[PDB]
Design a protein around this ligand. Structure first.
Ligand SMILES: O=C(COc1ccc(-c2oc3cc(O)c(C(=O)O)cc3c2C#Cc2cccc(Cl)c2)cc1)NC1CC1
Length: 302
């Protein structure tokens, strides 16, 4: 089939059969079930993350990176100085399109910039606040205007500009290391779409759009984090992936939101952690298909 046909089918299929909360529940339960079998089978060890030297570098003891996809550090390499709670996530064309990680600890702030630097990351997407439900969900790794430089080891970070949008902030950062200066764009998403508001998914689509404005390709990975580096981090990731497919006309005929999330959850534990976040992905994806079908229609009008 061709893109228009595959998109029309997904569109029609959804219309002719709305999914229900219970079906969503049933779907998501299967995903969690697969994780169980994978555990029992020892398919994705987390040996490195469980090492004593690394325990204190994990924000959530239950959330550890699979050995096979964990991001390795080699910049200014102590013997366990190579570990960070982060996993490479594959893009549509190849691997290492994204790096899903945790909101850094005061103890791993130096590790965070090492990684961002060792992989020439240009974009960081933060999907949480510093404080949530009265708890500290992320240490300050960025810099704000008027603050000058902040120091994390040999790293000097400062903020040149800040673009304030409705639900997020875009901080233009200047990172210096060894007489070299790079520009990093931090996207701080200080809100989240609401389950009871179909339109509330619009802000997240605008976020990813802007991001993609700053990097359309997959030359370097895009770093995405929340607090655990799973949940919201997975949603943004799943949508970007699905959108990249739509934009480049390569939506496999056998495409399902279900398979997508399944693929992701085998690259990072609980990348999309809840049924609510699963539904948001389904809803957001659907909207993307409609917008893409429109593009197909206006190009068919030549
Ligand atoms: O490490 C711990 C403490 O337990 C935990 C407490 C909270 C979380 C947790 O952090 C998050 C951070 C996020 O940033 C998002 C997020 O993306 O929103 C979601 C969660 C989330 C979550 C969740 C969640 C809540 C209810 C139901 C389900 Cl299925 C998941 C994870 C683990 N215990 C170890 C002894 C074993």
């Amino acid at each position: 089939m061709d893109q228009r046909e595959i998109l029309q089918k997904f569109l029609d299929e959804a219309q002719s059969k709305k999914i229900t909360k219970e079906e969503f529940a049933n779907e998501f339960l299967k995903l969690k079930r697969q994780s169980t079998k994978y555990k029992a089978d020892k398919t994705y060890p987390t040996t490195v993350a469980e090492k004593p030297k690394n325990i204190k570098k994990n924000r959530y003891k239950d959330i550890l990176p699979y050995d096979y996809s964990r991001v390795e550090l080699s910049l200014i390499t102590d013997e366990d100085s190579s570990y960070i709670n982060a996993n490479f996530i594959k893009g549509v064309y190849g691997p290492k399109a994204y790096i899903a990680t945790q909101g850094p600890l005061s103890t791993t702030l130096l590790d965070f910039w090492r990684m961002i630097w060792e992989y020439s990351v240009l974009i960081i997407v933060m999907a949480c606040m510093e404080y949530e439900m009265g708890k500290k969900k992320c240490e300050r790794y960025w810099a704000e205007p008027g603050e000058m430089q902040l120091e994390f080891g040999p790293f000097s970070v400062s903020c040149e500009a800040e673009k304030r949008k409705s639900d997020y902030i875009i901080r233009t950062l200047k990172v210096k290391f060894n007489s070299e200066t790079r520009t990093i764009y931090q996207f701080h998403y200080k809100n989240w779409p609401d389950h009871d508001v179909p339109s509330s998914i619009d802000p997240i689509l605008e976020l990813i759009w802007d991001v993609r404005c700053y990097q359309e390709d997959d030359s370097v990975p895009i770093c995405i984090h929340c607090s655990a580096g799973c949940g919201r981090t997975g949603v943004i990731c799943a949508i970007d992936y699905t959108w990249m497919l739509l934009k480049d006309g390569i939506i496999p005929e056998n495409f399902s939101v279900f398979s997508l999330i399944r693929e992701m959850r085998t690259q990072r534990p609980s990348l999309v952690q809840t049924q609510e976040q699963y539904e948001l992905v389904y809803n957001a994806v659907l909207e993307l298909f409609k917008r893409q079908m429109d593009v197909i229609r206006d190009k068919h009008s030549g």
